[PDB]
Design a protein around this ligand. Sequence first.
Ligand code: A1ADA
Ligand code: A1ADA
Ligand code: CL
Ligand code: CL
Lengths: 4, 4, 123, 123
Amino acid sequence: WVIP
Amino acid sequence: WVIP
Amino acid sequence: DSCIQFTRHASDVLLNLNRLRSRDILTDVVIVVSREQFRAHKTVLMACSGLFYSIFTDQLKCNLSVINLDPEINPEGFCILLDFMYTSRLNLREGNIMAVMATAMYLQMEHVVDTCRKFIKAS
Amino acid sequence: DSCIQFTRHASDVLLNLNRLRSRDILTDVVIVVSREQFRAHKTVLMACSGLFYSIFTDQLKCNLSVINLDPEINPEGFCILLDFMYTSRLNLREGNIMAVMATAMYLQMEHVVDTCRKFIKAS
Ligand SMILES: CN(C)c1ncc(Cl)c(Nc2ccc3c(c2)CC(=O)N3)n1
Ligand SMILES: CN(C)c1ncc(Cl)c(Nc2ccc3c(c2)CC(=O)N3)n1
Ligand SMILES: [Cl-]
Ligand SMILES: [Cl-]
């Protein structure tokens, strides 16, 4: 999971 | 396009 | 094999499937959550959820145009997860995280359940 | 928005759609190319091809279970492109590049046409  |  | 690969292909496919959903093109099922109705593509639901995969591989349920979820399922939690299915983006907030995790456990969306557990553990 | 994103989601969705294709689950169209028949999902075809997008948004053609391609289309070229649609992998070889480029131009798959033009220019 990432900060888009 | 890339070499997978 | 000796294939070449187009990096953005999967993302571009998903973006177009979401465009079809937004215009209600070739949607073949309505998911009923309490009073709320959500139109979607069975194939996308199966690709994202262990529960929908089980439902639509069933020889009788594969032909249903309406699926009613358990009355305990929250419509907002479902809406956030349906958006994730079609975009890879999860709108996870303090006010919705419990309903999102419970809905993801019911829908059998393992990666969503994992990030909810981690975010809850941090707080 | 304040969304989080799952990097592998789009690729995982496409991998599952290809698993459904391989097992012939929820396929809703057969594409006829000369004597050869190819089963697929209309939504995936539309998501990958400008030609299929035009065909299945048409109020009459959207309901067809069989689509016949132009007799000039080579079945091997189509097979390679259908595989690309479901995997992001293109089996481009010296012996098939002309048939692949011609099929991609007909199907309106801009990124495939671009890599074929570049590979031909190099040789
Ligand atoms: C497991 N399998 C062969 C398969 N083939 C095709 C599809 Cl569409 C599919 N989808 C599915 C099944 C289980 C789960 C998911 C999708 C997401 C998840 O967390 N569990 N799973
Ligand atoms: C252009 N548009 C709004 C849109 N919405 C939904 C879909 Cl499924 C779609 N697909 C499509 C159209 C044109 C092209 C492609 C897909 C691939 C391409 O090279 N050209 N295009
Ligand atoms: Cl997931
Ligand atoms: Cl393309």
